[PDB]
């Protein structure tokens, strides 16, 4: 999804922007899911060491899996939402390797038919 | 002749006895062979009317060479299922899939719950 | 005087069996399809959803 | 109503009067004119399809009636009104695969 | 929504939950309590609903209502005409009941 | 007894009458009013035994579709009046029992009229029956039995009578449950959930035993963990 | 599925060869019954509510994982046919 | 008694070392078996104690997204390698525990390089924390405390140091528990439930343990509608 941004998006240049976009996002300066410059304040707030945690946390209602977030995949950092990250679990369950399933899948799109 | 005590009577089974396919309905002796009107395999329900006409016709006529007749009515009590079908004023056909128990549908903020659910998709 | 070991000897019977499944206009060759029967409770036949554009169903 | 009524399915009352007796098959009733006439009911009639066709009462021992009121209801009938289904509620949300 | 607080119950944490979901969605005016927030969704016909096998709520409101409907007519369409051994046809041996 | 328990719900009730009974258990830990009220919905919806009409005779009529000279109502009509009819037993180890019912005359035979019983009650005497317009002599006896769950009229199949009609029954006393979790707020933490469910029932069970004999069903299913293999 | 579908299509040219010869392997199977395996010591197939899975609940899935083991050989003409289509149907 | 008693629901297990459990109750009567799978699964994975890195200090770290000098990792994948470290207490008394590190060196720190504590200890040694570049000053200390479920780190704010850094706890052992109900049949009928729970837990507790632990908490939950007022 994707809903607005009523303040500064600038965030590449400022580091203070972090805690200060944080700040913001604790009132209504900018919601969880914003429009920023390089990221969203969700995928500054949210950092998850592996996909258990992610979909763990979206059990306990704190982020939904349409929400985007930096995920630590079996070597990278990925900017996606819990939803597209379970749709690759799902992938990589039903077959036995997942670097394969990993390679013939198109984890970036909505999956259209 | 076991199971003939449904038989009541000469031949016609007694009215309001249950019947299951299979079941002798009509006993009718040929040459003695039996050739006797049975349930056919699949449902049967109760009896409620038995009409004999014979050659004593009061008013009525019969097929030539046909000494008599019997027609048997047999009713019963359908209720919904999974077969059946079902559909609104708005073309809607469907199928019954599923006759889910009342605990496991969705139901209200109040502990009403709903009766039928419908898919979107066919709207 | 169906009995719980006649339901035991069916589903023994059709362990590997299959059947042929068949819409009236079969129009291809994906208007048969072989199955294998799983025993259900009820009037109808259950079918997988996905095959419902194979048949025109 | 007006289905109802145009398809010969339920009983009216001819004329004003007040309802003699009834009963499960037959139904009695007294006109103003003290002229009494008896209307049978086909109970379970077969019909063409293997249907059933009832007419069950919609009056009381005692009851006045008016001038083209309803006497019983017709096989498809709650009170003089077409009612062949049923009222539900529905829920129009994809469940499991159902 | 009287007789729901006739009891004395206001408004569920599910529902808090569905209503802050359905907002972050456009379909409820952001700002308002979950009074009038609850009343503007069921102007629009969708009522929050509770899953019964899990008991959280369903994720987003639902359309539910009083549909009118009917059996309609079921002859031997449906009825299993399955047979294995039977009567045979008397010209040709193709098996016919 | 304190951090724990006292962190944990006092159980309080209200009922009126025998029919409608609220329970309410505060506070608890954040997640488990869900947790616990939908089981016991489950349950109490669905494993609650009871009592309901069984079979039906009629002294007049020798089978379903028939009717009775001098009643204004089918015979389907009777069994579907029948249905509605509440019974509560005073004896548990009492099963099934077998009312009877003699009328005549202009009558509006309602559930009242029944022959009164050692330990049987009718909490709706006001149930509607038949109407009886004149000589229209109705003599009937109904079979009641306790059970669980619903239960199809030819499944049971209970033949007492050449000429009894066996029916439909529904085995709960349970008419409907809906469990609500709010808010609550303690000292030390501000969000708690109270959990509160109320129960409508048909009187046959008044509402906390039917809570009782749900805690005890889900207790006993969850002893079947106890025991790996 | 069935075990190894792929690996049946692996060492056949032909799918409607495999069907033949899986196929045809059942047939000796029913014939002199199923003693005549090349499987019996460990690897049998096991049924579920019992060891059911060890004389002859269905035949062809005995005749695929036994085509899936080395123990089974076929050929256009590997036999002098006279012989053995003779002395197969007499027991 | 096959109906109710001979199934006692068959409770068969399946354990692929300390992470992996499957587990199988069969038969079960219909309605139960999502009435059963549903509270345990969400008491596993909302109310198991365990313990969790709930905060770091490192010596020059102002920022929790700088870059420290002489180490490839930044802050950001220094504290998430962090995250998954499993540690279990000897004994019950422990509620948080302080554990340092001093390395230095062109070497990988891993969890064994820890400095030992008696009454704790390390189910995953070999977890490679971080690497060392060039004689890396790595001076780092953390505080692990026990808990339940999944707690952000903004909320709670434990603070030890000045410039010490919050963590994401996640004290649930159980990584994910994963259930799934299928309608199995008995002999004569084919509405039952054949009940099958899947856990993948860190390792700190075998499944069978988690499992057991949650029936107990729900057993004494249900054991709170006892005493009424």
Same mark, same amino acid.
């Not at chain 6, 249905?83 to 004896?91: A, C, G, I």
């Given at each position: 999804?994707?809903?607005?941004?009523?303040?500064?998006?600038?965030?590449?240049?400022?580091?203070?922007?972090?805690?200060?976009?944080?700040?913001?996002?604790?009132?209504?300066?900018?919601?969880?899911?914003?429009?920023?410059?390089?990221?969203?304040?969700?995928?500054?707030?949210?950092?998850?060491?592996?996909?258990?945690?992610?979909?763990?946390?979206?059990?306990?209602?704190?982020?939904?899996?349409?929400?985007?977030?930096?995920?630590?995949?079996?070597?990278?950092?990925?900017?996606?939402?819990?939803?597209?990250?379970?749709?690759?679990?799902?992938?990589?369950?039903?077959?036995?390797?997942?670097?394969?399933?990993?390679?013939?899948?198109?984890?970036?799109?909505?999956?259209?038919? | 002749?076991?199971?003939?005590?449904?038989?009541?009577?000469?031949?016609?089974?007694?009215?309001?006895?249950?019947?299951? @396919?299979?079941?002798?309905?009509?006993?009718?002796?040929?040459?003695?062979?039996?050739?006797?009107?049975?349930?056919?395999?699949?449902?049967?329900?109760?009896?409620?009317?038995?009409?004999?006409?014979?050659?004593?016709? @009061?008013?009525?006529?019969?097929? @030539?060479?046909?000494?008599?007749?019997?027609?048997?009515?047999?009713?019963?009590?359908?209720?919904?299922?999974?077969?059946?079908?079902?559909?609104?004023?708005?073309?809607?056909?469907?199928?019954?899939?599923?006759?889910?128990?009342?605990?496991?549908?969705?139901?209200?903020?109040?502990?009403?719950?709903?009766?039928?659910?419908?898919?979107?998709?066919?709207? | 005087?169906?009995?719980?070991?006649?339901?035991?000897?069916? /589903? /023994?019977?059709?362990?590997?069996?299959?059947?042929?499944?068949?819409?009236?206009?079969?129009?291809?060759?994906?208007?048969?399809?072989?199955?294998?029967?799983?025993?259900? /409770?009820?009037?109808?036949?259950?079918?997988?959803?996905?095959?419902? /554009?194979?048949?025109?169903? | 109503?007006?289905?109802?009524?145009?398809?010969?399915? %339920?009983?009216? %009352?001819?004329?004003?009067?007040?309802?003699?007796?009834?009963?499960?098959?037959?139904?009695?009733?007294?006109?103003?004119?003290?002229?009494?006439?008896?209307?049978?009911?086909?109970?379970?009639?077969?019909?063409?399809?293997?249907?059933?066709?009832?007419?069950?009462?919609?009056?009381?021992?005692?009851?006045?009636?008016?001038?083209?009121?309803?006497?019983?209801?017709?096989?498809?009938?709650?009170?003089?009104?077409?009612?062949?289904?049923?009222?539900?509620?529905?829920?129009?949300?994809?469940?499991?695969?159902? | 929504? #009287?007789?729901?607080? #006739?009891?004395?119950?206001?408004?569920?944490?599910?529902?808090?939950?569905?209503?802050?979901?359905?907002?972050?969605? #456009?379909?409820?005016?952001? &700002?308002?309590?979950?009074?009038?927030?609850?009343?503007?969704?069921?102007?629009?016909?969708?009522?929050?609903?509770?899953?019964?096998?899990?008991?959280?709520?369903?994720?987003?409101?639902?359309?539910? #209502?009083?549909?009118?409907?009917?059996?309609?007519?079921?002859?031997?369409?449906?009825?299993?005409?399955?047979?294995?051994? &039977?009567?045979?046809?008397?010209?040709?041996?193709?098996?016919?009941? | 007894?304190?951090?724990?328990?006292?962190?944990?719900?006092?159980?309080?009730?209200?009922?009126?009458?025998?029919?409608?009974?609220?329970?309410?258990?505060?506070?608890?830990?954040?997640?488990?009013?869900?947790?616990?009220?939908?089981?016991?919905?489950?349950?109490?919806?669905?494993?609650?035994?009871?009592?309901?009409?069984?079979?039906?005779?009629?002294?007049?009529?020798?089978?379903?579709?028939?009717?009775?000279?001098?009643?204004?109502? =089918?015979?389907?009509?009777?069994?579907?009046?029948?249905?509605?009819?509440?019974?509560?037993? *005073?004896?548990?180890?009492?099963?099934?029992?077998? *009312?009877?019912?003699?009328?005549?005359?202009?009558?509006?035979?309602?559930?009242?009229?029944?022959?009164?019983?050692?330990?049987?009650?009718?909490?709706?005497?006001? *149930?509607?029956?038949?109407?009886?317009?004149?000589?229209?002599?109705?003599?009937?006896?109904?079979?009641?039995?306790?059970?669980?769950?619903?239960?199809?009229?030819?499944?049971?199949?209970?033949?007492?009578?050449?000429?009894?009609?066996?029916? =439909?029954?529904?085995?709960?006393?349970?008419?409907?449950?809906?469990?609500?979790?709010? =808010?609550?707020?303690?000292?030390?933490?501000?969000?708690? =959930?109270?959990?509160?469910?109320?129960?409508?029932?048909?009187?046959?069970?008044?509402?906390?035993?039917?809570?009782?004999?749900?805690?005890?069903?889900?207790?006993?299913?969850?002893?079947?963990?106890?025991?790996?293999? | 599925?069935?075990?190894?579908?792929?690996?049946?299509?692996?060492?056949?040219?032909?799918?409607?060869?495999?069907?033949?010869?899986?196929?045809?392997?059942?047939?000796?199977?029913?014939?002199?019954?199923?003693?005549?395996?090349?499987?019996?010591?460990?690897?049998?197939?096991?049924?579920?509510?019992?060891?059911?899975?060890?004389?002859?609940?269905?035949?062809?899935?005995?005749?695929?994982?036994?085509?899936?083991?080395?123990?089974?050989?076929?050929?256009?003409?590997?036999?002098?046919?006279?012989?053995?289509?003779?002395?197969?149907?007499?027991?």
């Amino acid at each position: 999804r994707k809903e607005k941004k009523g303040a500064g998006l600038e965030f590449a240049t400022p580091e203070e922007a972090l805690a200060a976009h944080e700040r913001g996002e604790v009132a209504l300066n900018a919601p969880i899911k914003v429009a920023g410059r390089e990221t969203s304040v969700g995928r500054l707030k949210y950092v998850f060491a592996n996909p258990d945690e992610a979909l763990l946390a979206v059990a306990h209602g704190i982020v939904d899996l349409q929400d985007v977030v930096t995920v630590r995949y079996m070597g990278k950092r990925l900017e996606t939402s819990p939803g597209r990250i379970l749709f690759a679990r799902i992938v990589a369950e039903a077959v036995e390797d997942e670097k394969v399933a990993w390679e013939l899948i198109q984890l970036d799109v909505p999956q259209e038919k | 002749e076991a199971a003939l005590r449904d038989l009541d009577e000469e031949g016609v089974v007694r009215i309001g006895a249950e019947v299951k @396919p299979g079941d002798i309905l009509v006993g009718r002796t040929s040459f003695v062979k039996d050739t006797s009107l049975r349930v056919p395999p699949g449902e049967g329900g109760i009896v409620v009317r038995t009409v004999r006409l014979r050659r004593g016709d @009061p008013g009525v006529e019969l097929k @030539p060479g046909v000494r008599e007749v019997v027609r048997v009515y047999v009713a019963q009590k359908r209720k919904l299922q999974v077969g059946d079908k079902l559909a609104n004023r708005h073309g809607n056909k469907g199928v019954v899939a599923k006759i889910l128990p009342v605990e496991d549908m969705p139901h209200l903020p109040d502990g009403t719950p709903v009766d039928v659910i419908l898919n979107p998709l066919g709207v | 005087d169906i009995k719980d070991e006649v339901w035991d000897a069916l /589903e /023994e019977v059709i362990h590997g069996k299959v059947v042929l499944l068949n819409r009236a206009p079969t129009l291809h060759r994906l208007g048969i399809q072989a199955f294998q029967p799983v025993l259900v /409770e009820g009037q109808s036949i259950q079918l997988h959803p996905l095959v419902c /554009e194979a048949f025109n169903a | 109503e007006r289905v109802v009524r145009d398809s010969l399915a %339920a009983l009216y %009352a001819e004329e004003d009067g007040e309802v003699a007796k009834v009963d499960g098959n037959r139904i009695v009733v007294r006109y103003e004119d003290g002229r009494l006439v008896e209307y049978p009911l086909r109970r379970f009639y077969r019909s063409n399809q293997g249907t059933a066709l009832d007419q069950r009462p919609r009056v009381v021992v005692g009851q006045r009636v008016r001038k083209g009121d309803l006497l019983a209801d017709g096989p498809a009938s709650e009170n003089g009104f077409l009612a062949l289904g049923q009222n539900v509620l529905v829920a129009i949300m994809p469940f499991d695969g159902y | 929504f #009287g007789k729901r607080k #006739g009891e004395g119950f206001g408004v569920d944490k599910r529902e808090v939950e569905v209503l802050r979901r359905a907002e972050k969605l #456009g379909l409820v005016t952001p &700002g308002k309590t979950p009074e009038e927030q609850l009343k503007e969704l069921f102007l629009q016909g969708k009522v929050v609903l509770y899953d019964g096998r899990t008991g959280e709520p369903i994720e987003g409101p639902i359309v539910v #209502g009083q549909m009118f409907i009917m059996k309609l007519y079921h002859m031997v369409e449906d009825k299993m005409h399955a047979r294995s051994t &039977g009567p045979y046809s008397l010209i040709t041996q193709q098996p016919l009941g | 007894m304190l951090d724990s328990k006292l962190k944990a719900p006092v159980f309080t009730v209200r009922t009126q009458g025998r029919e409608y009974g609220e329970f309410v258990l505060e506070p608890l830990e954040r997640g488990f009013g869900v947790t616990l009220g939908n089981p016991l919905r489950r349950i109490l919806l669905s494993s609650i035994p009871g009592t309901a009409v069984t079979s039906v005779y009629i002294e007049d009529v020798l089978h379903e579709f028939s009717t009775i000279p001098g009643v204004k109502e =089918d015979v389907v009509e009777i069994i579907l009046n029948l249905k509605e009819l509440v019974v509560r037993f *005073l004896n548990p180890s009492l099963q099934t029992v077998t *009312l009877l019912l003699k009328a005549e005359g202009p009558k509006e035979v309602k559930a009242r009229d029944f022959l009164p019983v050692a330990d049987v009650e009718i909490m709706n005497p006001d *149930l509607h029956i038949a109407t009886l317009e004149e000589g229209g002599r109705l003599n009937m006896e109904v079979r009641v039995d306790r059970g669980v769950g619903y239960v199809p009229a030819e499944k049971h199949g209970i033949k007492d009578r050449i000429n009894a009609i066996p029916v =439909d029954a529904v085995f709960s006393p349970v008419r409907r449950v809906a469990f609500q979790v709010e =808010d609550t707020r303690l000292g030390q933490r501000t969000d708690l =959930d109270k959990l509160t469910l109320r129960i409508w029932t048909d009187g046959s069970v008044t509402p906390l035993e039917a809570l009782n004999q749900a805690v005890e069903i889900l207790r006993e299913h969850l002893t079947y963990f106890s025991n790996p293999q | 599925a069935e075990p190894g579908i792929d690996k049946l299509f692996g060492m056949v040219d032909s799918k409607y060869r495999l069907t033949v010869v899986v196929a045809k392997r059942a047939q000796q199977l029913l014939r002199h019954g199923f003693k005549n395996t090349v499987l019996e010591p460990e690897e049998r197939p096991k049924m579920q509510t019992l060891e059911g899975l060890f004389d002859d609940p269905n035949a062809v899935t005995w005749a695929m994982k036994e085509l899936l083991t080395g123990r089974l050989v076929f050929g256009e003409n590997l036999v002098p046919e006279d012989r053995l289509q003779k002395e197969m149907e007499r027991l």
